[PDB]
Paper text:
Among the SLC4 transporters, Na+-dependent members function as either symporters or exchangers that mediate their specific physiologic roles in different cell types by thermodynamically coupling the transport of Na+ to base (HCO3− or CO32−) with or without simultaneous Cl− transport. To further improve our general understanding of these transporters, we investigated the structural and functional properties of human NBCe1, a Na+-coupled SLC4 symporter, using cryo electron microscopy (cryoEM) and functional mutagenesis studies. The transporter is a member of the anion exchanger family belonging to the APC superfamily, the second largest secondary carrier superfamily. The 3.9 Å structure of NBCe1 provides a common framework for the Na+-coupled SLC4 transporters that underlies their functional properties.
Numbering used by the authors:
A (entry chain A), B (entry chain B): 401 to 582, 638 to 712, 735 to 814, 826 to 965
The structure:
Amino acid sequence: GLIKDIKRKAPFFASDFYDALNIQALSAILFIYLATVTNAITFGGLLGDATDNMQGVLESFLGTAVSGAIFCLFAGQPLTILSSTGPVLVFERLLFNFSKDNNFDYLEFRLWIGLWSAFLCLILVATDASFLVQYFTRFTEEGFSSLISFIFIYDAFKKMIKLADYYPINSNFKVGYNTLFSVGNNCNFVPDITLMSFILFLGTYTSSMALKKFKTSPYFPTTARKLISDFAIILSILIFCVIDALVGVDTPKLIVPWVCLAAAIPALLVTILIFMDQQITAVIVNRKEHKLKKGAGYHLDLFWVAILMVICSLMALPWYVAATVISIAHIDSLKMEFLGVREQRVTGTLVFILTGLSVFMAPILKFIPMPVLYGVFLYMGVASLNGVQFMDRLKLLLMPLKHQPDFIYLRHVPLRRVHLFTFLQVLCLALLWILKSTVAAIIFPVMILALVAVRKGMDYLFSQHDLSFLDDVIPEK
Amino acid sequence: GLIKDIKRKAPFFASDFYDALNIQALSAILFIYLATVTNAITFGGLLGDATDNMQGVLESFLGTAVSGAIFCLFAGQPLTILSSTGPVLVFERLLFNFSKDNNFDYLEFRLWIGLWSAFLCLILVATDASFLVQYFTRFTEEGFSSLISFIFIYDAFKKMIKLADYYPINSNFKVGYNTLFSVGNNCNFVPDITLMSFILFLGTYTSSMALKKFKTSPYFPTTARKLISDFAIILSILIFCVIDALVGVDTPKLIVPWVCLAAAIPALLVTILIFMDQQITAVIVNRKEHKLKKGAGYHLDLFWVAILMVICSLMALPWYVAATVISIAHIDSLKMEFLGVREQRVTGTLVFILTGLSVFMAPILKFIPMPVLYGVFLYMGVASLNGVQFMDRLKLLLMPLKHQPDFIYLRHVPLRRVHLFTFLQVLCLALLWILKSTVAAIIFPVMILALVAVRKGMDYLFSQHDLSFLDDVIPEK
């Protein structure tokens, strides 16, 4: 079982905490704190349909406070961050309407939804959770990484067109006094927030992507160039924090404070997706490209999420599976120069402690504008697909032929097969995009099992292949 | 005289017009048309203090219509563009106040100001106009090129802080009906133009500088990449033209339609600066870096500006000396790949014909926003100091030492002298900056003769020098 997994993760606990005093370890904490407290508040409104008051503190903060805290001590590379996700949210919209017809119970119904689903998860940690060596082999693991990035980028722009529809421009001026507002007439709609917002938003993407490319620019000293190429995101929030302060217009800103066996069959459903989400939020984090790691825990974290599932279910707290875009944005920061990454254990868990400090003099977090935080979402989206192999060939359709690729000797004669392979890979994303639009994400791995099905169709046209995992840069000499 | 100069410029007239059918020759016309009709309208307001009605057409358009037209047929590399400039404008503020105490004559006084100044210019074309080989030798000709660029960039930002002070933000909202405007109360000041304006302005600089750097990016076909890297500026105006159209807020936009001998001594003054402006707006355009040119006319253009001086003086039209930033932005466009530039004669003179077409269905030029045209000023400012030598060393103070310079063997042992030389060159710009602030630009070459004076002070610390002209890239092998 997980005893063979906990045996190799055990002799590293003292080696990690004394590896966490570096300066850039401070960078990733207050960055991802700003990401997580944004990702907490942006789902607290969406989940705020069902669970309305229930406490003198909003439960989505205290939920993600303890759930990552007990996780990211050590959980089999705890570089991953637990938070809430897409499919669990849309399921609870369904389950609230499935319990809107008064099946005697709603929240206590969710208990026996949550309790037996952990029990099914405790059977799955006992039997086997290992699908790596024949299912997720370098196709449809970028093919999901490069699709959940495209949703998270598209979720960024959607959260501002909703902002633009909440702050509508009058678009009729230069005359003067004809747009008085007053239960009034003709002018009950705001000016000049949304035009300010796209300055901050497009700025802090163009700022943050500039200071990361600043690392190669020679026009500053090197040992300070590394210090600015790692504090890049946080002061890009600070620069546009005070530009919001100088320009006296406001904006949205952060503001922080028979029953049982019928509950078996939806617990049969949620233990599928929470299981299936955990692997693909792990196999992209494992990622042999991220060189010189110090362990790979697949069972105990899946055992860890079952432990926190019953304490979240008992206290009416939302179920929390590992992240996919924030974790690959986490471990972007924690790396030297390639020469390995890290194994920092406190940076993964200080971010939940500072999340646990709910107020932390909340006026110090009140004058951060909300649209600058959508920009650092769009930076984490675009930078999440940096090192994937699939983008290096989707930008090869547009690349004319008399140019240089990377790998040698095995696809230089089938040049046309490259253009055929990625077009097949682009083709399956369009299926998964439009099935995400309908109600088919609650059955979540059906866009993964059908996604890995065409990997078996690839076996009918076979040759030598460097289209396989554990092999990213090969010098051959 | 100029007979030896007109003798070599004569055997090229038929060679130029048949050299003007290329596609990128169309690019530079409608770009610089948009620059010149902006530079006409932006001085027509400033000169609009004195000459108020005087015609059913604004005289600043028809002024720059004919004055570049008869010039840029052929005038000794007519790549330069005539327009109005700084020092002539501030002189006419002085002369209007010098004639505000009713010295019997204002406009007809300017006749005998203009007429004898041309007569003094006709003596100076007869005697000698050749100061090259001992005064403007690669120091203080970048030293003026890299200073008039810094004024033109600083003039761009100043024209929007004036725009921001004309459209002031209320900066007090989210409540609602407390800011009614009504001879009213508390709300007689506009919203949401100036926040729109900095989107267009910073955008069309970041857009235009991106599409010029697009030329090296492989992710598009090459023979279309050259077509987009030369239409870069004009459609960057078009892209942000329609973004202004979609976003329904307006902005400022383009909207086009005893006496004699006392007049000797100011005509003694203006024939200094108009003479002195012409050389430094020519020696930066001559520029042996711009390889493989086909002539160098120094006398006949100075004879040409005297011809148009009397027709401008007779019709009450402003005096028009050659440009310094637009001309180096002109000949940026007209170049192949380095491999020479051009000798196009119609592109320099079609731009005044289209300027001469004043209306040209002026509603087709009415919905171009004025703040996108300040952006293409700031692009022409920053790109004017591209190839200067002085910026390549002012960005060497910030460059730490274990790095690569360009030239070999003569300043690699005096590394410290490089840091001393440019600091001396930075020092004289600060003198010229603060003397430009006071009333010392009307005596304009006193910041040039004192500028070339420290070139003689350089002779006391002499060695071998590659700090000299006609020598820019040297392979030495």
